[PDB]
Design a protein around this ligand. Structure first.
Ligand SMILES: *[C@@H]1O[C@H](CO)[C@@H](O[C@@H]2O[C@H](CO)[C@@H](O[C@@H]3O[C@H](CO)[C@@H](O)[C@H](O[C@H]4O[C@H](CO)[C@@H](O)[C@H](O)[C@@H]4O)[C@@H]3O)[C@H](O)[C@H]2NC(C)=O)[C@H](O)[C@H]1NC(C)=O
Ligand SMILES: *[C@@H]1O[C@H](CO)[C@@H](O[C@@H]2O[C@H](CO)[C@@H](O)[C@H](O)[C@H]2NC(C)=O)[C@H](O)[C@H]1NC(C)=O
Ligand SMILES: [Zn+2]
Lengths: 861, 4
């Protein structure tokens, strides 16, 4: 007979809830199969003779329903129906269950270790001898626990878990809780009974069967922080371990809540596909994201480790102790951890200077949000798997930004208290979006803020506001409007926000709050002010525009003192100035006059904003006909940066931000023939060539000295003979970019032709195309060899898109737009080409708008 | 995670 699957919803019925799972997993890492018995204690809220749960790619051997114990213990068999399309299964009982009476489902199943790195999946690694060894691991977010064991796989059905793993003596098991006892079950078997967990969600259950070494430390709370990894690299886990300990202590103090587990394990999984996952008690990480080698694997690796560990541990409280009711609030989760990365490291590891990274992330978030193709942070997910791919990390970065704006509006300690009260009222339970806001509002400043209503305006609406300030005596007029950057058409939305404005004036040094809830509002000051500046600290997720002569007074403030406002404040001024120059509300003059202040600037964040906005203008001018203005603009840029370039040292000292800036400034100063830098680089290059590479060169200056070393054929042939032998990335790609900065077009065509046959060539085509002398060469070679090229690199990835867009991204003249369209017609290819043609048309537009102005501006000075 |  045929039985209709007794359920037609996407969510599980709400009236049958589990209490406690008893999981027995028995996996075989050489057969790549694993069988299991799971026991689920359940309670029915209503009478029903069917139980609906999740199971995916598991052949249910047999399932039974037990009730009671002792003389009353009863066991019935259960009929099993399977709805694979929905990843569901029904268990049909002969007589309906009794409301509130406890039952126990027992399911015997088996499956295959997943190759797809989802669920209970297999991973491999090679020891330092070539011996290939396997291990099994889990990745359940968002809904893959269905694959390791049947269950109510929704994050609001929290249960306890009693996990038991059958493994060989060779292996070693780890899970969320500590191992209580190991019992020899059979000849080659060993059962690891892990402690019973606290009430948690399914997708955070984790276990690992591996042959890992570990290194452990204990915090003041007695928590045992251990880092597991492969035996070869385990001497690379000291740093991550100390960071985990420090950050665990920080989080215990900040949340005023003890870490809710007895221990905490950071596992370095080989070829990890998700970067890291916050399994309660057993956080997993890509190898590169957790381990640190003496020979610097990267100048930014030792910071990625700290930010990763801070995020993953932040989730141990916010997210696992208190978890979202449904995936439609996952954004908040990823927001908080991401914001906590900033709050925590900023205190724990002050030497890393995480602030620059975080605020740059906010800049990128706004840049995306300002476009028509953007979505609000909070979106109703009807299926977690279908709409978990639609969500993008930029949404989560917004989330963190918004949360920072909020933390700064409300007192910092007010925010902290709201978090403490949120996590205490809701431990071991599930929360909605609005619950955090409600907890935020009930905090008293040591006017009610009504955080709920305000926050809804930022979460439920795409985009952010542009804020315009007009000052007539003591009357400060404020305007808000959806800042939409798309210049195509005139579509307008009535979006309004609750903007938590913050300002400072030339008189009072104190920060002033003002919550703009309407389109227009007026704020009265005690006395006239020399100048005023809104969005103090760059924390709020908006941009201000000063009407009348405000921009003048602020430009004068910067040029006169510039320390009057904070480093971030100056970075904000630059960013907003140019973004407003884009939407036609500020003269390009005003923006350049502003940038003039940059001769005194020492901090990295404003200098980088200024570079981000000034370099592309010069890059556009490179493809331009006349250089009589291009040279003048490059001269203006180097006059700007002359003091800052001189200030820098030729080492690898400082934070990631400072090293990156050092590299940029030195390579820039040397690529435009700055006497001091060119001569020093030639000196380093001579000494390097004398030893044939034996002499160590600072990795931050190697790009400058190699870019100068490829000038004359003498150094160029040397660098080519050197790159031939090298395979390392830092060793080879730096020399590659060096050889691509040559004033000898013969070497250029030689490199093109030879690299076509696989000498690398994907990036080489672009890095050669964006060369001032030979940029037409790279665009003309792609037309005659396009068929062979597309054949070699097929479709997808970034090769095709990086070399098609790279060769046509900085085109200034319309004569070249015709040459792009007449090419791509003769042939996600269409998407790449459409983006490229659109950006070229925008280039010609910006030229038409601003070139004649910039020329005149470059004269007055 | 990705942070991002
Ligand atoms: C996964 O499946 C594989 C098989 O596909 C399975 O591997 C086999 O396990 C058995 C049991 O451990 C192995 O047989 C043992 O080999 C060791 C090492 O040589 C011997 O020491 C053992 O002999 C002892 O036990 C005998 C019987 O009790 C005694 O007579 C003797 O005195 C010893 O004390 C025993 O022969 C076998 O070598 C492997 N490999 C293969 C190819 O069979 C593995 O156990 C499975 N793992 C899980 C977790 O299910
Ligand atoms: C894991 O995959 C294998 C196939 O790669 C499955 O093996 C099949 O099992 C069915 C039913 O037991 C047989 O009729 C087929 O002949 C088997 N195929 C092979 C190639 O052996 C196996 O069933 C999968 N694991 C589970 C738990 O279903
Ligand atoms: Zn996260």
């Amino acid at each position: 007979d045929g039985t209709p699957f007794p359920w037609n919803k996407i969510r599980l019925p709400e009236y049958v809830i589990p209490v406690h799972y008893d999981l027995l997993i028995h996996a075989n890492l050489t057969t790549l199969t694993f069988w299991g018995t799971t026991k689920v204690e359940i309670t029915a809220s209503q009478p029903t003779s069917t139980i609906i749960l999740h199971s995916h790619h598991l052949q249910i051997s047999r399932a039974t329903l037990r009730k009671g114990a002792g003389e009353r213990l009863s066991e019935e068999p259960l009929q099993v129906l399977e709805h694979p399309r929905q990843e569901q299964i029904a268990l049909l009982a002969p007589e309906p269950l009794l409301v509130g009476l406890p039952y126990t489902v027992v399911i015997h199943y088996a499956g295959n270790l997943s190759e797809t790195f989802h669920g209970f999946y297999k991973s491999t690694y090679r020891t330092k001898e070539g011996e290939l060894r396997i291990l099994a691991s889990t990745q359940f977010e968002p809904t893959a626990a269905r694959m390791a064991f049947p269950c109510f796989d929704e994050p609001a059905f929290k249960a306890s878990f009693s996990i038991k793993i059958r493994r060989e003596p060779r292996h070693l098991a780890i899970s969320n809780m500590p191992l209580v006892k190991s019992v020899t079950v059979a000849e080659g078997l060993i059962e690891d009974h892990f402690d019973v967990t606290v009430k948690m969600s399914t997708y955070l259950v984790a276990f690992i069967i591996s042959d890992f070494e570990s290194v452990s430390k204990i915090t003041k709370s007695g928590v045992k922080v251990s880092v597991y990894a492969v035996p070869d690299k385990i001497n690379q886990a000291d740093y991550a371990l100390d960071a985990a300990v420090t950050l665990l202590e920080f989080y215990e103090d900040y949340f005023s809540i003890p870490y809710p587990l007895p221990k905490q394990d950071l596992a370095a999984i080989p070829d990890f596909q998700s970067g890291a996952m916050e399994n309660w008690g057993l956080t997993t990480y890509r190898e590169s994201a957790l381990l640190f080698d003496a020979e610097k694997s990267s100048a930014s690796s030792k910071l990625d480790i700290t930010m990763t560990v801070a995020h993953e541990l932040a989730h141990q409280w916010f997210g696992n102790l208190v978890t979202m009711e449904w995936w439609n609030d996952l954004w908040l989760n990823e927001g908080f951890a991401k914001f906590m990365e900033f709050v925590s490291v900023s205190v724990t590891h002050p030497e890393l200077k995480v602030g620059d990274y975080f605020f740059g992330k906010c800049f990128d978030a706004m840049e995306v949000d300002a476009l028509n193709s953007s979505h609000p942070v909070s979106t109703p997910v009807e299926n977690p798997a279908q709409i978990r791919e639609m969500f993008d990390d930029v949404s989560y970065d917004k989330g963190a930004c918004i949360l920072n704006m909020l933390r700064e509006y409300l007192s910092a300690d007010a925010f902290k208290s709201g978090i403490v009260q949120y996590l205490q009222k809701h431990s071991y339970k599930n929360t909605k979006n609005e619950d955090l806001w409600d907890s935020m509002a009930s905090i008293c400043p040591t006017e009610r803020v009504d955080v709920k209503t305000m926050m809804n305006t930022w979460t439920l609406q795409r985009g952010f506001p542009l804020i315009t300030i007009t000052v007539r005596g003591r009357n400060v007029h404020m305007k808000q409007e959806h800042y939409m950057k798309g210049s195509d058409g005139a579509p307008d939305t009535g979006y309004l926000w609750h903007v938590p404005l913050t300002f400072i004036t030339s008189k009072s040094d104190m920060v002033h709050r003002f919550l703009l809830k309407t389109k227009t509002d007026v704020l009265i000051l005690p006395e006239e002010v020399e100048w005023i500046k809104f969005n103090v600290g760059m924390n709020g997720y908006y941009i201000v525009h000063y009407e009348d002569d405000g921009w003048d007074s602020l430009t004068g403030l910067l040029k006169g003192t510039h320390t009057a406002v904070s480093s971030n404040d100056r970075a904000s001024l630059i960013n907003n100035a140019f973004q407003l120059v884009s939407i036609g509300k500020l003269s390009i003059e005003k923006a350049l006059d502003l940038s003039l202040y940059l001769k005194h600037e020492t901090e990295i964040m404003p200098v980088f904003q200024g570079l981000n906005e000034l370099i592309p203008m010069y890059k556009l001018m490179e493809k331009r006909d006349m250089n009589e203005v291009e040279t003048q603009f490059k001269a203006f840029l180097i006059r700007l940066l002359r003091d800052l370039i001189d200030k820098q040292t030729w080492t690898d000292e400082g934070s990631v931000s400072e090293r990156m800036l050092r590299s940029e400034l030195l390579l820039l100063a040397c690529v435009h023939n700055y006497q001091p830098c060119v001569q020093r680089a030639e000196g380093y290059f001579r000494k390097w060539k004398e030893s044939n590479g034996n002499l160590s060169l600072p990795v931050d200056v190697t790009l400058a000295v190699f870019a100068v070393g490829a000038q004359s054929t003498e150094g160029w042939d040397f660098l080519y003979s050197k790159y031939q032998f090298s395979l390392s990335s830092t060793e080879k790609s730096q020399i590659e970019f060096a050889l691509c900065r040559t004033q000898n077009k013969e070497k250029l065509q030689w490199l093109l032709d030879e690299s076509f046959k696989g000498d690398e060539f994907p990036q080489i085509l672009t890095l050669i195309g964006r060369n001032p002398v030979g940029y037409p060469l790279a665009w003309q070679f792609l037309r005659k060899n396009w068929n062979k090229l597309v054949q070699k690199f097929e479709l997808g990835s970034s090769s095709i898109a990086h070399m098609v867009m790279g060769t046509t991204n900085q085109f200034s003249t319309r004569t070249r737009l015709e040459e792009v369209k007449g090419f791509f017609s003769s042939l996600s290819q269409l998407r790449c080409v459409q983006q490229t043609i659109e950006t070229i048309e925008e280039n010609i537009g910006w030229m038409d708008k601003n070139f004649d102005k910039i020329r005149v501006w470059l004269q007055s000075e | 995670x990705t942070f991002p």
